[PDB]
Structure 1
Amino acid sequence: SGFRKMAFPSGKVEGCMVQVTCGTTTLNGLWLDDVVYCPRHVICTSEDMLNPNYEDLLIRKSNHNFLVQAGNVQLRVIGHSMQNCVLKLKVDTANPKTPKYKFVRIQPGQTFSVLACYNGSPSGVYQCAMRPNFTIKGSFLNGSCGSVGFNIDYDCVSFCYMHHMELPTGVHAGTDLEGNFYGPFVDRQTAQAAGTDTTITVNVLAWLYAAVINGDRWFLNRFTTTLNDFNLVAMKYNYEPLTQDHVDILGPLSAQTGIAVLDMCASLKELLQNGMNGRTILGSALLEDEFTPFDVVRQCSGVTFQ
């Protein structure tokens, strides 16, 4: 019993974090096999952060213009290339701690663990979600660039996020490990701003199922809803639309608890209308939307507390 924001154990990723320095700029890189991945804006000078031409900036660099430090060891850079917004530095030593890994590009609503790092050294681990507006609500200070997000289902590290920058509302933007940004953002100092964000409806429903599994039913009601009437109501509270794909994804949780998906939708509609009247759900006084259906099945018992 209990229910917590639960990250993956971070050791497999800790063994890959290094420090990358170019000029006066230092940030983090990810060392896998004989390649170090980092944000290409490590080659941006202070003079001009507004309109960098990264092709022109990089052709001026020699391999020895990049200093890579793994703990106390300097790694020798022997080649470099740019892929989208990520710089790939070839080094002369393969990382002996390289885990089984893959690169995955995730969809909004998906969650992952973040290992926040400074100067190549890990500071802490937390859970995040890719918001509908393609930002993440991270906790990142100056120098956190190059920190990564990941999942480790079944002993394989799936890297899905590399941190690049902070937006004006204090939320965060970055890329996949192929260097393609999530959302419309660019690695320039522009007036760019996150769009209006929305609540991840399928995740709220998963978390309501988690509450039932852990023994609390107070928020249920005698009603049901059509999918279209649910979406017409939920969107008035700035909730994302619920699709038939989402309904299908919630099937296993519905089967374990005996609560039909559209009956749980009716409960959510009433919670939005009424609030909690001084009660809490899984320790929260707000509706939580950064646990996915997969996350709830991972964390919760397979046996409902009836």
Structure 2
Amino acid sequence: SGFRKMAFPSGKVEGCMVQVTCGTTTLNGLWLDDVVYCPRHVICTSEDMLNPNYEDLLIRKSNHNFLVQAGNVQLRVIGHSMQNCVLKLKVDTANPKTPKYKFVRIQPGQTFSVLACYNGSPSGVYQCAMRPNFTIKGSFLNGSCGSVGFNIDYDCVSFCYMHHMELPTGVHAGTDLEGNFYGPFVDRQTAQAAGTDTTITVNVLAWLYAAVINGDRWFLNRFTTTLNDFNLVAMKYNYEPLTQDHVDILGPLSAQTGIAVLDMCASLKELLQNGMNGRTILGSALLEDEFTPFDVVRQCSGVTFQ
């Protein structure tokens, strides 16, 4: 037993990571088949990022202005194109390490693993949730752009995130692999507001079920509630409203533990109104919302990948 924030094994994504340089800007690219994907602001100087015209900046670039390096090996660039906020660099060599993969646009509340990279080289791996306000709370230093987020299902890597920006508030923003930003963000160094950062209610509930499965039971109360009455409390505490879809997804955890979803809702409501009184739940002193219901089942069942 025990319960930990876990990232997916990252070996499949390590084999795809390259370094992309244009002029004096260097960041990370993702090399799948004969295409390298990277943030389009590889073509930007520090000054350009204040207010870039990406079309006009890219006009000045040719294939040979893009240096793509994998280890100590130069990939030859035979074509380039801008898709929303990503560049796609056609290279003359397919990555022999390409895994079975997909591109997916994930929903708010879903989670994924980030392989933090610098100069094309892997540095570490950690788990992230796409917040309801479409930011992520990550660990990204200068040169980490082009790092990707992904999920693994058996032998298939589902890429869902590419890192582009740190907001002046210290949280992080990026795109799917088609270059479309999550949230209302743009790849420009200007002040950008993410709205209210609400809590992923269905995720908090799955984590409470994981706690019960692992023996943390103290917070189990003897109240129940209703969806509408719980959501009254949830809105007060800036929690996402719980819907029957969310109840449905929690079904298996409800079944395994014998705790009706609305009973857990009443327990969470009490935690929201009373705090934790100096106690912890699965080693944490606040309510954790970056575990999905599938994350819980995955870890309480030991799913493997090949």
Q: Do the two structures share a fold, i.e. TM-score over 0.5?
A: yes
Q: In terms of mean alpha carbon deviation, does 186-195 or 145-154 score higher?
A: 186-195
Question: In 1, are the aligned partners of 2:155 and 2:305 still within 8 Å (CA)?
Answer: no
1:48 deviation in Å?
Answer: 2.4
Question: In 2, are the aligned partners of 1:256 and 1:303 still within 8 Å (CA)?
Answer: no
Q: Which runs of 4+ in 1 moved over 6 A?
A: 302-306
1:190 deviation in Å?
Answer: 1.4
Query: 1:104 corresponds to which residue?
Result: 104
1:301 deviation in Å?
Answer: 4.1
Shift in alpha-carbon separation, 1:4–1:272, aligned structure 2, 3 A: same
Question: In 1, are the aligned partners of 2:111 and 2:292 still within 8 Å (CA)?
Answer: yes
Q: For 1:192 and 1:278, how far apart are their aligned partners in 2?
A: 36
1:56 deviation in Å?
Answer: 1.5
Q: In terms of mean alpha carbon deviation, does 136-145 or 295-304 score higher?
A: 295-304
SS at match of 2:95: coil
Query: 2:204 corresponds to which residue?
Result: 204
Q: In the TM superposition, what whole-angstrom CA distance separates every residue of 1:18-62 from its partner, at most 9, and x where no partner exists?
A: 000000000000000000000001111233223222112112211
Q: For 2:187 and 2:249, how far apart are their aligned partners in 1?
A: 35
1:279 deviation in Å?
Answer: 1.8
Give the length in aligned residue pairs.
306
1:276 deviation in Å?
Answer: 1.8
Residues 271-282 of structure 1 aligned to structure 2 (within 5 Å): 271-282=271-282
Normalised by the size of structure 1, how large is the TM-score? 0.97
Query: 2:138 corresponds to which residue?
Result: 138
1:238 deviation in Å?
Answer: 1.2
Q: In the TM superposition, what whole-angstrom CA distance separates every residue of 1:161-206 from its partner, at most 9, and x where no partner exists?
A: 0000000111000000000000000011111122220111000000
Q: In the TM superposition, what whole-angstrom CA distance separates every residue of 1:261-291 from its partner, at most 9, and x where no partner exists?
A: 0000000001111222222111111110000
Shift in alpha-carbon separation, 1:148–1:218, aligned structure 2, 3 A: same
Shift in alpha-carbon separation, 1:179–1:259, aligned structure 2, 3 A: same
Q: For 1:161 and 1:98, how far apart are their aligned partners in 2?
A: 17
Question: In 2, are the aligned partners of 1:161 and 1:177 still within 8 Å (CA)?
Answer: yes
1:305 deviation in Å?
Answer: 26
Question: In 2, are the aligned partners of 1:214 and 1:304 still within 8 Å (CA)?
Answer: no
Normalised by the size of structure 2, how large is the TM-score? 0.97
Question: In 1, are the aligned partners of 2:152 and 2:305 still within 8 Å (CA)?
Answer: no
1:302 deviation in Å?
Answer: 8.8
Shift in alpha-carbon separation, 1:304–1:230, aligned structure 2, 3 A: farther
Shift in alpha-carbon separation, 1:262–1:45, aligned structure 2, 3 A: same
Q: Which runs of 5+ in 2 are unaligned?
A: none
Q: For 2:15 and 2:252, how far apart are their aligned partners in 1?
A: 36
Q: For 1:55 and 1:113, how far apart are their aligned partners in 2?
A: 32
Question: In 1, are the aligned partners of 2:154 and 2:305 still within 8 Å (CA)?
Answer: no
Q: Percent identity?
A: 100
Q: In terms of mean alpha carbon deviation, does 263-272 or 275-284 score higher?
A: 275-284
Q: In the TM superposition, what whole-angstrom CA distance separates every residue of 1:47-95 from its partner, at most 9, and x where no partner exists?
A: 3223222112112211000000000001110000111100000001110
Q: Which runs of 5+ in 1 are unaligned?
A: none
Shift in alpha-carbon separation, 1:193–1:63, aligned structure 2, 3 A: same
Q: In terms of mean alpha carbon deviation, does 141-150 or 42-51 score higher?
A: 42-51
